């Protein structure tokens, strides 16, 4: 799913050529893309720092996650690596959404099945909400680039709430 494939899908569902409405929709994406791609480049360039900082923000907010025994916690080397990996997944998904101009990548790769996974593995959505909030507070973006990044970060937060 992207702004362009959604336009194509709507047209195809009705057996018709792309409408002027749909061309305007694609233009709308092209116009927004400068801000989106700026956000993607920046988040990518700062990825390791954002991921490391976000993980630390979670451990700080929820100290028990570093202490309690169990596979679901970051109280082992494996657990700490799983956590940083997951946070990296979220950040990577945000950059994909920015690149295509919609939530499709996040929806398909991350949000579908999320509730099942979090319940099954005893992972708290609130841990991930804190990581995402750290990213918002620390990406250092401005203007519409910041707006774009925060829109997709907030989309993930909404899904976890």
């Amino acid at each position: 799913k992207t702004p362009i494939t959604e336009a194509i899908a709507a047209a195809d569902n009705q057996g018709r050529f792309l409408s002027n409405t749909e061309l305007q929709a694609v233009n709308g994406r092209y116009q927004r893309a400068a801000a989106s791609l700026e956000a993607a480049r920046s988040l990518t360039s700062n990825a390791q720092r954002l991921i490391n900082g976000a993980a630390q923000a979670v451990y700080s907010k929820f100290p028990y996650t570093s202490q309690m025994p169990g596979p679901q916690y970051a109280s082992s080397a494996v657990g700490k690596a799983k956590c940083a990996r997951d946070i990296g997944y979220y950040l990577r998904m945000v950059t994909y959404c920015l690149v295509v101009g919609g939530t499709g990548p996040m929806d398909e790769y991350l949000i579908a099945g999320l509730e099942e996974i979090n319940r099954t593995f005893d992972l708290s959505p609130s841990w991930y909400v804190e990581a995402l909030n750290y990213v918002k507070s620390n990406h250092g973006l401005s203007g519409q680039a910041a707006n774009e990044a925060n829109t997709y970060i907030d989309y993930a937060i909404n899904a976890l709430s």
Binding site: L18, T44, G101
Partner: protein
């Protein structure tokens, strides 16, 4: 897939962020966006003429198609034939806006050869029609009149590939 999704899908399978080079390539596609929209608009805006003129030329060159017993004889078969020409043009136009042939392949061209073979539709004749549409669509899309002058040669080559893909598939 669109061109943007294609790169993302490949990256996700590798667990990687897009590189700066990849981001720059996408920015370039965006910068060519106005031209791409003009191509789609021009083809769409002339769709009836593109299909009808190509069909007329096809039947003029291959009169057997329309004579009694021919595959495009009867109004029902003629309508189905015109519909197929329009369908192919439509899916080609989708591929253009997407900058990717996946929609054309997946929803239109896949299995079409075998579909035609089973029905007795002469695929080779459909390909002639498709190639006629290619020439008129490109001539229309690349018309220098009534548009800000610029270079669309890359786009016209790309458009050509989609038409050729369709012709090959039948």
């Amino acid at each position: 897939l669109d061109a943007f999704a294609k790169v993302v899908a490949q990256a996700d399978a590798r667990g990687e962020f897009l590189s700066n080079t990849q981001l720059d390539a996408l920015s370039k596609m965006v910068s060519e966006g106005n031209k791409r929209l003009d191509v789609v608009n021009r083809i769409t805006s002339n769709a009836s003429a593109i299909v009808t003129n190509a069909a007329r030329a096809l039947f003029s060159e291959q009169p057997q198609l329309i004579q009694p017993g021919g595959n495009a004889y009867t109004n029902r078969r003629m309508a189905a034939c015109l519909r197929d020409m329009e369908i192919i043009l439509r899916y080609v136009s989708y591929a253009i806006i997407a900058g990717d042939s996946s929609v054309l392949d997946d929803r239109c061209l896949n299995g079409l050869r075998e579909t035609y073979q089973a029905l007795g539709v002469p695929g080779a004749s459909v390909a002639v029609g498709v190639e006629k549409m290619k020439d008129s669509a490109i001539a229309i899309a690349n018309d220098p009149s009534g548009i800000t002058t610029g270079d669309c040669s890359a786009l016209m080559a790309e458009v050509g590939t989609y038409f050729d893909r369709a012709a090959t598939a039948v």
